[PDB]
Amino acid sequence: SGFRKMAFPSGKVEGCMVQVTCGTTTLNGLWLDDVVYCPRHVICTSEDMLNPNYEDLLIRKSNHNFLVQAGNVQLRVIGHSMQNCVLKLKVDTANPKTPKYKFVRIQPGQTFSVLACYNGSPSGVYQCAMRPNFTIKGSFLNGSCGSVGFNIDYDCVSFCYMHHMELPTGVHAGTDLEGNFYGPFVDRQTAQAAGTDTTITVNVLAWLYAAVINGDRWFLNRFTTTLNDFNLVAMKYNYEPLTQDHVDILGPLSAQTGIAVLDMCASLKELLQNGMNGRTILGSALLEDEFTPFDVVRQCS
Amino acid sequence: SGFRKMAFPSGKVEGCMVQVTCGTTTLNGLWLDDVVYCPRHVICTSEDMLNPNYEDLLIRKSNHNFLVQAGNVQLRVIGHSMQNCVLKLKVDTANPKTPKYKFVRIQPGQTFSVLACYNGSPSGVYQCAMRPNFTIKGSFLNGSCGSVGFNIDYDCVSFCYMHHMELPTGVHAGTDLEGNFYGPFVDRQTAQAAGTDTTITVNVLAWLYAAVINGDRWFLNRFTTTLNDFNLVAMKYNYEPLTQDHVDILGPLSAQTGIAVLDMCASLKELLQNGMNGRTILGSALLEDEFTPFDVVRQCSGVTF
Ligand SMILES: [Cl-]
Ligand SMILES: [Cl-]
């Protein structure tokens, strides 16, 4: 029993992290087979970042402009190319620790584990949700670009995030491993901002189920509601609309608890309106929205 | 920027996790060099757990009564011994993935990463603090006994916790890797219960310093406090006493931020009195006490915002 935010074990990813240096810029790369993946802004100087022409900046670079360090071992770069906002450096040595892996783009609302790294060296692990506004609430300092996010399914690492930048509110933005940004962000030092954060309704509901399953039952009531009335409340509180697909995904937990989703929604309605009346749910004084239904089922049944 | 409960990268510990079976009971063990460490209650039936005599249960066991599996490789046990509440199984193979490591016993307030495991297979990693009542607030299903807690400051893995039991309130108890329980708990199905818990004051202060480092000052005030007056107030909120050792330990964060320790204590006294008036601190609506001063320095910029 118990309920905690928990990351996937990071060992399979630790063994892929390397240090990539281009000129004066050093950040992290991901070494899979004989290719190292990293943010393309590694090729940029400060003045470049102000308005980069990445095509031209890359054309004027050669293999010899890149230094890749796997621990103490230097990896010789023998090719380079760009895919979207990711730089691909072909190296002379296949990573003998390459896990079984896929590149997958994740959907907003879903979670993944971040291995925060500095200078090619793993420093910590934590779980993040891809938020509706396509940012993540990470913990990153300078030198962390190229840190990756991932999920593990059996033996297969699904890489879904590479870290590129910090936004003014302190939240974080990046790309998938094919170099496509999550959200309307660009890899240039220009005015950029997180849009309005909206709350992930299905995850809040999931977490209330987790609370019930862990003996926190005080928010429950005899009442139920409809999708339409609830969604009018959700809109007022900058919650995402709840869909029938969401209701269906929560089905296991409705059954497990005997609390139907729209019954739980009446609970959530009061909490949004009347508040939490001084209590806590699962040790929080806020409504938590970064636990998916899956995340919750893994620990509550 | 940002501030998160951040675990250590778990790989060095993942390579040490094995599956230990005795009888019908399976749980996790820790394979370091040629020894596997696991809870001695693996030799107990459920009937044995009310009043087991571990000496008498163990003398009846042969090496071949212990099945140790590392992935799909069966390890051969060639000896055994009990050290307090931990069973040490000598195996015929030294673990080639053994990291540099040490065993440490921690004090209440200290944090560590837990690699939750089942049937020898790692499932997740998360941070825990040793609570003042010698329990941890973990997430463990049945089969998770033998999961370990650790830190990896610098180059070696410091193992500080092995999981043994769940208490009635849903919190967790275990031992150091020399098999000595934290707290008064025993590997026996007794009516035993966690003591009343209290808030780790020095960690709350460290976290308030983290909030200042990350650019937030709204909770400061114009007041100061003596250490004694601070403790007289804090104890009324079930906060642990703050000691001169704690004040000394917070010196580096005080120097980085320019906020005297006892001035930050005055801020905490006011936060306890007022609440947050709808604000959050580092994303939380309550005062967080599972980040140590060392945790904050580990994670935060060395330059205050
Ligand atoms: Cl909270
Ligand atoms: Cl300690």
Residue tagged 């997740």 (tokens): B124
User: Cβ separation of A280 and B299 shorter than 8 Å?
Assistant: no
The answer to whether B225 and B266 have CB atoms below 8 angstroms apart is yes
Q: Helix A293-300 to helix A201-213 angle, to the nearest 10 degrees?
A: 10
Separation of B210 CA from ligand 2 center, angstroms? 20
The answer to whether A21 and A38 have CB atoms below 8 angstroms apart is no
Cα–Cα distances in angstroms (integers) from residue A54 to residues A27, A62, A181, B3, B186, in the given order? 18, 14, 16, 32, 64
The answer to whether B63 and B78 have CB atoms below 8 angstroms apart is yes
Residue A218 neighbours by CB distance under 10 Å: 14
Spatial separation of the C-alpha atoms in residues B164 and B144, rounded to whole Å? 8
Burial of A282 per CB tally in 10 Å (0-12, 13-18, 19+): middle
The answer to whether A123 and A90 have CB atoms below 8 angstroms apart is no
Tell how far CA A8 is from the center of its chain.
Answer: 13
* DSSP bridge pairs for B18: B29
Residue A42 structure tokens: 């590694």
Q: What phi, psi does B103 have (nearest 5°)?
A: -105, 130
Spatial separation of the C-alpha atoms in residues B221 and A263, rounded to whole Å? 44
Instruction: Work out the minimum CA distance from B55 to partner chain A, whole angstroms.
Output: 30
State the method.
Answer: X-ray
User: What's the Rg (C-alpha) of chain A?
Assistant: 22
Spatial separation of the C-alpha atoms in residues B46 and B32, rounded to whole Å? 28
Spatial separation of the C-alpha atoms in residues A123 and B262, rounded to whole Å? 32
Spatial separation of the C-alpha atoms in residues B121 and A110, rounded to whole Å? 24
The answer to whether A208 and A219 have CB atoms below 8 angstroms apart is yes
Q: Helix B201-213 to helix B261-274 angle, to the nearest 10 degrees?
A: 100
Q: What is the longest distance spanned by two Cα atoms in chain B?
A: 69
Structure resolution in Å? 1.6
Closest to B146 (Cα-Cα) out of B42, B61, B44: B42
User: Cβ separation of B11 and A14 shorter than 8 Å?
Assistant: yes
Q: Helix A261-273 to helix A201-213 angle, to the nearest 10 degrees?
A: 100
Cα–Cα distances in angstroms (integers) from residue B204 to residues B5, B268, B275, in the given order? 14, 8, 14
Chain A CB contacts of B9 under 8 Å are: 10-11, 14, 115, 122-125
Instruction: Work out the minimum CA distance from A59 to partner chain B, whole angstroms.
Output: 34
Listed as own residue / partner, the contacts of B51-54 with beta carbons closer than 8 Å and 24 or more positions apart are B51/B188, B52/B187, B52/B188, B54/B82
The answer to whether A78 and A91 have CB atoms below 8 angstroms apart is yes
Burial of A174 per CB tally in 10 Å (0-12, 13-18, 19+): buried
User: Cβ separation of A139 and B8 shorter than 8 Å?
Assistant: no
The answer to whether A97 and A113 have CB atoms below 8 angstroms apart is no
The answer to whether A161 and A178 have CB atoms below 8 angstroms apart is no
Residue A122 sits at the vertex; the CA angle it makes with A117 and A127, to the nearest 5 degrees, is 75
Residue of B nearest to A2 (CA): B139
The answer to whether A226 and A260 have CB atoms below 8 angstroms apart is no
Q: Backbone breaks in chain A (C–N > 2.5 Å) follow which residues?
A: none
The 3-state secondary structure of chain B reads CCCCCCECCCHHHHCCEEEEEECCEEEEEEEECCEEEEEHHHHCCCHHHCCCCHHHHHHCCCHHHEEEEECCEEECEEEEEEECCEEEEEECCCCCCCCCEEECCCCCCCEEEEEEEECCEEEEEEEEECCCCCCECCCCCCCCCCCEEEECCCCCEEEEEEEEEECCCCCEEEECCCCCECCCCCCCCCCCCCCCCCECHHHHHHHHHHHHHCCCCCCCCCCCCCHHHHHHHHHHHCECCCCHHHHHHCHHHHHHHCCCHHHHHHHHHHHHHHCCCCCCECCECCCCCCCCHHHHHHHCCCCCC
Q: Of the bound ligands, which one is closest to the alpha carbon of residue B130? A: 2
The 3-state secondary structure of B244-298 reads HHHHHHCHHHHHHHCCCHHHHHHHHHHHHHHCCCCCCECCECCCCCCCCHHHHHH
Burial of A142 per CB tally in 10 Å (0-12, 13-18, 19+): exposed
Residue tagged 């959050």 (tokens): B280
Residue B199 structure tokens: 């808030």
Instruction: Work out the minimum CA distance from B53 to partner chain A, whole angstroms.
Output: 28
Q: Testing the interface with B: which of A115, A125, A169, A171 to mutate, by most B Cβ within 10 A?
A: A125
Of B123, B286, B301, the CB nearest to A141: B301
Residue B70 structure tokens: 């590392």
Spatial separation of the C-alpha atoms in residues A66 and A73, rounded to whole Å? 14
User: Cβ separation of B11 and A8 shorter than 8 Å?
Assistant: no
Residue A55 neighbours by CB distance under 10 Å: 9
Instruction: Work out the minimum CA distance from B117 to partner chain A, whole angstroms.
Output: 10
Q: Give the CATH number of domain B201-299.
A: 1.10.1840.10
Chain A CB contacts of B172 under 8 Å are: 2
Of B138, B280, B284, the CB nearest to A2: B138
User: Cβ separation of A12 and B11 shorter than 8 Å?
Assistant: yes
**Strand pairing class (A121-129; B172-175):** unpaired
Residue B196 structure tokens: 């009343």
Separation of A203 CA from ligand 1 center, angstroms? 16
Residue A182 structure tokens: 């999550």
Q: b or e along A59-75 (b: 16 or more beta carbons within 10 Å of the residue's beta carbon)?
A: eebeeeebbbbbeeeeb
Residue B99 structure tokens: 């990291």
CA atoms within 13 A on the CB side of A300: 29
The yes/no answer on whether domain B11-90 falls in CATH 2.40.70.10 is: no
CA atoms within 13 A on the CB side of B79: 6
Spatial separation of the C-alpha atoms in residues A160 and A153, rounded to whole Å? 13
User: Cβ separation of B3 and A139 shorter than 8 Å?
Assistant: yes
Q: Does B285 touch chain A (CB under 8 A)?
A: yes
Spatial separation of the C-alpha atoms in residues A234 and A244, rounded to whole Å? 15
Residue tagged 């329980």 (tokens): B181
Spatial separation of the C-alpha atoms in residues B4 and A139, rounded to whole Å? 6
Q: What phi, psi does A195 have (nearest 5°)?
A: -70, 180
Residue A249 structure tokens: 């995904």
User: What's the Rg (C-alpha) of chain B?
Assistant: 22
Tell how far CA B217 is from the center of its chain.
Answer: 30
Spatial separation of the C-alpha atoms in residues B123 and B140, rounded to whole Å? 10
Q: Give the CATH number of domain A201-300.
A: 1.10.1840.10
**Strand pairing class (B17-22; A148-153):** unpaired
Spatial separation of the C-alpha atoms in residues A162 and A37, rounded to whole Å? 9
Residue A185 structure tokens: 């962000």
Closest to B5 (Cα-Cα) out of A197, A6, A13, A206: A6
CA atoms within 13 A on the CB side of A164: 29
Question: What phi-psi label fits residue A15: left (phi over 0), alpha (psi between -120 and 50 degrees) or beta?
Answer: alpha
Cα–Cα distances in angstroms (integers) from residue A227 to residues A94, A232, A245, A287, in the given order? 53, 9, 12, 20
Spatial separation of the C-alpha atoms in residues A279 and A211, rounded to whole Å? 13
A96: Cβ contacts below 8 Å, ≥ 6 apart: none
The answer to whether B134 and B200 have CB atoms below 8 angstroms apart is no
Q: Is B41 a catalytic residue?
A: yes
* DSSP bridge pairs for B87: B38, B82
Closest to A179 (Cα-Cα) out of A56, A37, A36, A35: A37
Spatial separation of the C-alpha atoms in residues B170 and A214, rounded to whole Å? 9
Closest to B188 (Cα-Cα) out of B58, B28, B45, B52: B52
The yes/no answer on whether domain A11-91 falls in CATH 1.10.10.10 is: no
User: Cβ separation of A283 and B6 shorter than 8 Å?
Assistant: no
The 3-state secondary structure of chain A reads CCCCCCECCCHHHHCCEEEEEECCEEEEEEEECCEEEEEHHHHCCHHHHHCCCHHHHHHCCCHHHEEEEECCEEECEEEEEEECCEEEEEECCCCCCCCCEEECCCCCCCEEEEEEEECCEEEEEEEEECCCCCCECCCCCCCCCCCEEEEEECCEEEEEEEEEEECCCCCEEEECCCCCECCCCCCCCCCCCCCCCCECHHHHHHHHHHHHHCCCCCCCCCCCCCHHHHHHHHHHCCECCCCHHHHHHCHHHHHHHCCCHHHHHHHHHHHHHCCCCCCCECCECCCCCCCCHHHHHHHHC
**Strand pairing class (A121-129; A156-166):** unpaired
Spatial separation of the C-alpha atoms in residues B113 and A9, rounded to whole Å? 11
Spatial separation of the C-alpha atoms in residues B157 and A224, rounded to whole Å? 51
Spatial separation of the C-alpha atoms in residues A110 and A127, rounded to whole Å? 11
Q: Helix A227-236 to helix A261-273 angle, to the nearest 10 degrees?
A: 30
Spatial separation of the C-alpha atoms in residues B61 and B25, rounded to whole Å? 14
Q: Does B7 touch chain A (CB under 8 A)?
A: yes
Spatial separation of the C-alpha atoms in residues A124 and A115, rounded to whole Å? 6
The answer to whether A30 and A159 have CB atoms below 8 angstroms apart is yes
